[PDB]
């Protein structure tokens, strides 16, 4: 039917900063649990709450605090922010204490030293080599999302509108091309004949994860908040 | 308690169409076991839950893993043909029977590589204070970095007079990738400018790399990336 949620889903803060994490536990569910997990790293457990009382604490940092409400849903309250809390923060709900837990899909915080560092990608779309073509009769479009910092990007291909998977090929990890700018590339593969029907529509469509309405930013450039990049083609006859 | 589940093994690097086994040992007593997949940066994937070895539950569980509970509870993830979208953090979980509370596992990092010949471990760098900063600050901070490594198996940690230390260190949360085969990591350890002035105070950057298996196969030419224990250390000093 539906699972626990939770907002935001990607947050970016300056050292120093605070925020607020947020968790809707299924509905029917009185037991609300908080992780905090390093990237790549095991599970951490934080805290359990259940029936708005405290049940359980693990290693939850003095600067946290959390507290669940009337209708079950808990809060992080997370302050005076460091580089080292930068993690996935998941919380999961059971219908009681000592019961089966279901997960939130987590929260991605990163905390940066200078928000100025802050800069969408721009990406660009590489139509097929003409020597890729008469060689092999595949065709294939590179993808480059670059000048990013920092790296929360979602990359996505669309062909005549819809997403498509098959022939895709993504960098698994982006990587710094300088101390603030990310790069990732990806190629879509295609049949020679697909790629050269003129009608065809290609879009490599990006998501960047930035700053939100709610972070100053200073007068000068635009704002660096969440938003999407993309570059298309068409497909070309011989 | 008295312990929690355990998992094997801890890490471990893989060639594209290859298969491996992940397994888990639940808590004394446990007898229901589920396993979930984690990219990394994302979300637990639930894949299957066996009950007094009873398949249950099953959620998108590729065709390629097959999954058993055996007669001690304990379970073994059997992989094949692995992908490289394959990589990522296995964990297992245990509750006494289905519905209850589950504990986790350590988890298993399992990475899968087109080519074993990329691996490498890192090189470790220990850099003394800057005699601006001891003589401005009255802090001594010794920086680590370890790099050149691939993949992202690495883990630092900071002795003092033999003993690990927790206070005054700073470690970079996550390593970043420099290029498509080699990642970055850098610690601090700061501590007072008189504790640094001692030349019998031993300070050592301690970084564990874990690679290649005794038993996979290398090429003849330079040393195989297995894993293995590399620091770098300095002792305090004297007025300069």
């Known amino acids: 039917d539906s699972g626990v949620v939770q907002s935001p889903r990607h947050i970016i803060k300056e050292k120093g900063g605070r925020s607020v994490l947020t968790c809707?536990?299924?509905?029917?569910?009185?037991?609300?649990?908080?992780y905090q997990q390093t990237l790549g790293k095991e599970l951490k457990f934080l805290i359990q709450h259940y029936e708005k009382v405290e049940r359980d604490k693990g290693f939850l940092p003095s600067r946290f605090s959390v507290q669940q409400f009337d209708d079950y849903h808990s809060e992080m309250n997370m302050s005076a922010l460091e580089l080292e809390d930068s993690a996935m923060?998941?919380?999961?709900?059971?219908?009681?204490?000592?019961?089966?837990?279901?997960?939130?899909?987590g929260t991605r915080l990163t905390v940066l030293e200078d928000l100025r560092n802050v800069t969408p990608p721009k990406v660009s779309l590489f139509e097929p080599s003409k020597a890729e073509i008469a060689n092999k009769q595949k065709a294939t479009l590179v993808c480059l999302a670059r000048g990013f910092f920092p790296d929360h990007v979602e990359l996505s291909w669309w062909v005549n509108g819809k997403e498509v998977h098959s022939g895709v090929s993504t960098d698994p990890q982006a990587y710094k091309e300088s101390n603030y700018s990310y790069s990732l590339s990806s190629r879509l593969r295609v049949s020679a004949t697909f790629w050269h029907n003129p009608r065809n529509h290609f879009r490599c469509q990006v998501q960047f994860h930035g700053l939100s309405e709610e972070d100053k930013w200073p007068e000068g450039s635009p704002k660096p908040v969440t938003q999407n990049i993309s570059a298309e083609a068409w497909g070309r006859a011989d | 308690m008295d312990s929690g589940v355990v998992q094997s093994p801890r890490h471990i690097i893989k060639e594209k169409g290859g298969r491996s086994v992940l397994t888990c040992i639940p808590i004394?007593?446990?007898?229901?076991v589920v396993w979930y997949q984690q990219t990394l940066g994302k979300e637990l994937k639930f894949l299957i839950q066996h009950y007094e070895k009873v398949e249950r539950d099953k959620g998108f569980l590729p065709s390629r893993f097959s999954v058993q509970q055996f007669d001690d509870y304990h379970s073994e993830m059997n992989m094949s043909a692995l992908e490289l979208e394959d990589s990522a953090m296995y964990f297992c979980?245990?509750?006494?029977?289905?519905?209850?509370?589950?504990?986790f596992g350590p988890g298993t990092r399992l990475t899968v590589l087109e080519d074993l010949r990329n691996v490498t471990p890192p090189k470790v760098s220990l850099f003394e204070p800057s005699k601006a900063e001891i003589a401005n600050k009255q802090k001594a901070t010794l920086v680590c970095l370890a790099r050149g490594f691939f993949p992202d198996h690495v883990e630092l940690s900071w002795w003092v007079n033999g003993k690990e230390v927790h206070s005054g260190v700073s470690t970079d949360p996550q390593a970043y990738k420099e290029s498509n085969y080699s990642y970055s990591l850098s610690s601090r350890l700061r501590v007072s400018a008189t504790f640094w002035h001692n030349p019998r105070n031993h300070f050592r950057c301690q970084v564990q790399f874990h690679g290649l298996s005794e038993e996979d196969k290398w090429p003849e030419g330079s040393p195989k990336p297995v894993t293995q224990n590399i620091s770098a250390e300095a002792w305090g000093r004297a007025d300069s």
């Open positions: 979980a245990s509750s006494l029977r289905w519905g209850d509370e589950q504990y």
């Open positions: 004394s007593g446990h007898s229901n």
